[PDB]
C-alpha cells in the first residue's frame, strides 16, 4: 500500500462499525501511512499498520495462515 484511495471503501465500513482495524500489508508508506496516523490521532478510526511476516513466496504462504485463524480473506 502507498495510497489512501484503496482504503477509503473499507476504512469507511470500519468507521461506521466502531471496532478497530489491523492492517497487515506487504508494506504501508507514502501519505497512506501518514494519513492513517492523523485518523486515529483524532479518533476517527483506530487503525494499525505492520509489514507482512516473511519474504518472497513464504510471505504469501504465512499471510494466508493468518487469514485462516481470523476468518478473513487475503486480498
Amino acid at each position: 500500500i502507498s495510497n489512501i484511495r484503496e482504503m477509503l471503501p473499507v476504512l469507511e465500513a470500519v468507521a461506521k462499525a466502531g471496532k478497530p482495524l489491523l492492517i497487515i500489508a506487504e508494506d504501508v508508506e507514502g501519505e497512506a501511512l501518514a494519513t492513517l496516523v492523523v485518523n486515529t490521532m483524532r479518533g476517527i478510526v483506530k487503525v494499525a499498520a505492520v509489514k507482512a511476516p516473511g519474504f518472497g513466496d513464504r510471505r504469501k504462504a504465512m499471510l494466508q495462515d493468518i487469514a485462516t485463524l481470523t476468518g478473513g480473506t487475503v486480498i
Binding site: N3, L8, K16, E31, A34, T35, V37, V38, N39, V45
Partner: protein, 97 residues
Amino acid sequence: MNIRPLHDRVIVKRKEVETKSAGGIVLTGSAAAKSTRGEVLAVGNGRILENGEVKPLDVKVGDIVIFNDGYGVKSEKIDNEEVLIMSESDILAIVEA
C-alpha cells in the same frame, strides 16, 4: 482596493483544499493535492473576438464554479487575500442548488 477584470476575464477565490471528509467519515489527510472549486468575485465585459460588439459572459458575480487549473490560470494578492484570474474558457461548470 477591489479589482476590475479586463473583458473575458473572471476573478475567483479557491475553496477548501481536500475538505477533510472524502469517502464519508474518513479524514483524508493532505495527500498532496488542491481544490478545483471557487467563487466568482468580479466579471469583465466579455470576449471581443469576431469584431461584432462584445458578448457578455455566462457567469454572474457570486456563482460557485468548477474550473480547470490550467496554464492560463494566474494567482494574485488583493488586500492579502488569495485570488485567481483566468478566462471563461477555463471555467467548466456551476454548482446550483
